[PDB]
């Protein structure tokens, strides 16, 4: 039902190694669909998913020009940032941006986003009202003052409520075979004895889409949150994701442990046990 579209900007200064590199990637949910890299041989927006290939030449030109124009803008932002923090031109710095929209089942706006970071720290964020801003420090307050004066919030709002949701709805239709298909995880429990009196039970989830999932071990029906080792969800490389959870259990106590799996591809949550 619910879906997202996000664009991600990274702008990285590199004094002595040319002008700041600017990279944009766009996602619908967990599917990458477009890319731009100012270091490319001939920088342009490029398709990264088959359903975006349907877009005509006018689309690709417009998108490429936005990226080219934003490369300049984000290069100026880096220069401005140096001044705001009293920094020298000899250091390397990074501005990031994430913006976009979520839609619910009916395709209407659930919420919009537009936020920036400087050197990995929150800088400024458009609030959920799409009307005001939160600045993280006195430097970003300077930016806020500028954006308040130029009514930037109002312009973001018109995008987020119009073009953002309209284009996302188009993408969801064109890529419905994949974007609107949830692939449930394949699950199993593995058993690795580590010593005579302790064994590792590892609960696997493979080949699932989208990325969101919950894997939990219970002992006697009790969540072992503190005792569970969880790896970060990782991409398989074929659009799908993998995850595992593990616990070290006393030898002879394996059957008191159940793995629980929740994912939107499943009709109901799964319970697994070590099948000796």
């Amino acid at each position: 039902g619910s879906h997202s579209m996000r664009y991600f900007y990274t702008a990285m200064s590199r004094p002595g190694r040319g002008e700041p590199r600017f990279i944009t990637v766009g996602y619908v949910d967990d599917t990458l669909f477009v890319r731009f890299d100012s270091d490319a041989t001939s920088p342009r927006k490029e398709p990264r998913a088959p359903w975006i290939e349907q877009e005509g030449p006018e689309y690709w030109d417009r998108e490429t020009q936005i990226s080219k124009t934003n490369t300049q803008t984000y290069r100026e932002n880096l220069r401005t940032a140096l001044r705001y923090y009293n920094q020298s031109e000899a250091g390397s710095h990074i501005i990031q941006r994430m913006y976009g929209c979520d839609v619910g089942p009916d395709g209407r706006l659930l919420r919009g986003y537009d936020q920036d970071a400087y050197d990995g720290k929150d800088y400024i964020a458009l609030n959920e009202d799409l009307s005001s801003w939160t600045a993280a420090d006195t430097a970003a307050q300077i930016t806020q003052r500028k954006w308040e004066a130029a009514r930037v919030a109002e312009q973001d709002r018109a995008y987020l409520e119009g073009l953002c949701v309209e284009s996302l709805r188009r993408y969801l239709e064109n890529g419905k075979e994949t974007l609107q298909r949830a692939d449930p995880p394949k699950t199993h429990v593995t058993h690795h004895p580590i010593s005579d009196h302790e064994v590792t039970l590892r609960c696997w989830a493979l080949g699932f889409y989208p990325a969101e999932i919950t894997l939990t071990w219970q002992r006697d029906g009790e969540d072992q949150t503190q005792d569970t080792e969880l790896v970060e969800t990782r991409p398989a490389g074929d659009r799908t994701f993998q995850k595992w959870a593990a616990v070290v259990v006393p030898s002879g106590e394996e059957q008191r442990y159940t793995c629980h799996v929740q994912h939107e591809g499943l009709p109901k949550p799964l319970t697994l046990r070590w099948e000796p």
């Binding site: 944009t24 936005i66 932002n77 940032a81 500028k146 954006w147 953002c164």
Partner: peptide
């Protein structure tokens, strides 16, 4: 589709 307007810090 991207928003064509981006504003200076």
């Amino acid at each position: 589709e991207e928003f064509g307007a981006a504003f200076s810090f």
